[PDB]
Every structure is written in structure tokens, then in C-alpha cells.
């Protein structure tokens, strides 16, 4: 399927506004499980539940364990670019 | 394949 590049702008006091599940230890990609109303992902648009996150800010998430992805994702700030594909 | 996956809000 199509790999979309999706932009999200986040203030430092805000979260991304997504929940993720999956990861290498489960044999699946990092997958979006929820988009939280009113937070940056919802406001900015373009992400959806069931998307596999292939990269964030050019950092590859394809073979990451869940906790690794949580770390990388949580460290991104400001203007953030996701690369995602719906699975 | 695991039946249980963590789910983390970010």
C-alpha cells in the first residue's frame, strides 16, 4: 500500500495524541491503536488506526521493539514527520 | 506470535 508522509506539529507541553501497539517482540510493525480527540495527531490529521509507523523524523521503526519505539517517538519535538502505511 | 501486546499512549 501507499507510504504516506504525515506532518504533525506539537508544542513541548503536549503529547503526540496517539497510542501505539505491536513491535518486533510480537512479529508485527509498530501499529497505531488510537488517535486521541483534540490532541496534535487528531488536530493535524493524516494518521489513522491500523497504520504501521515505518519511520518518524527519518528514524526507522520497522524492526523496533515496543519500548524502543516508545522512547524514539517520545523524544521527537516540534515539527514531526511520520512515514506510515495502512495494514 | 503473542496473544498479548502492550499499548502505550504518547
Curated annotation (Swiss-Prot), chain A:
It is found in: Cytoplasm; Golgi apparatus membrane; Golgi apparatus, trans-Golgi network membrane; Synapse. Ubiquitously expressed. Signal peptide: none annotated. It comes from the Eukaryota. Residues 5-87 form the PDZ domain. Homooligomer. Interacts with FZD5. Interacts with FZD8. Interacts with GRID2 and BECN1. Interacts with CSPG5. Interacts with CLCN3. Interacts with STX6. Interacts with CFTR. Interacts with ASIC3. Interacts with GOLGA3. Interacts with NLGN1. Interacts with RHOQ. Interacts with MARCHF2; the interaction leads to CFTR ubiquitination and degradation. Interacts with ADRB1. May interact with CACNG2. Interacts with CCDC62. (Microbial infection) Interacts with C.rodentium and E.coli (strain Sakai) NleG8. It is linked to A chromosomal aberration involving GOPC is found in a glioblastoma multiforme sample. An intra-chromosomal deletion del(6)(q21q21) is responsible for the formation of GOPC-ROS1 chimeric protein which has a constitutive receptor tyrosine kinase activity. Plays a role in intracellular protein trafficking and degradation. May regulate CFTR chloride currents and acid-induced ASIC3 currents by modulating cell surface expression of both channels. May also regulate the intracellular trafficking of the ADR1B receptor. May play a role in autophagy. Together with MARCHF2 mediates the ubiquitination and lysosomal degradation of CFTR. Overexpression results in CFTR intracellular retention and lysosomaldegradation in the lysosomes. The PDZ domain mediates interactions with FZD5, FZD8, ASIC3, GRID2, CLCN3. Also mediates interaction with CFTR and ADRB1. This is Golgi-associated PDZ and coiled-coil motif-containing protein. It comes from Homo sapiens (Human). The gene is GOPC. The chain holds residues 284 to 370 of 462 of the full protein.
Amino acid at each position: 500500500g501507499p507510504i504516506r508522509k504525515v506532518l504533525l506539529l506539537k508544542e513541548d507541553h503536549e503529547g503526540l495524541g496517539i497510542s501505539i501497539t505491536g513491535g518486533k517482540e510480537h512479529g508485527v510493525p509498530i501499529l497505531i491503536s488510537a488517535i486521541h480527540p483534540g490532541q496534535p495527531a487528531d488536530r493535524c490529521g493524516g494518521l489513522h488506526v491500523g497504520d504501521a509507523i515505518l519511520a518518524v523524523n527519518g528514524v526507522n521503526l520497522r524492526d523496533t521493539k515496543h519500548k524502543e519505539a516508545v522512547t524514539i517517538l517520545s523524544q521527537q519535538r516540534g515539527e514531526i514527520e511520520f512515514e506510515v502505511v495502512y495494514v | 506470535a503473542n496473544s498479548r501486546w502492550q499499548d502505550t499512549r504518547l
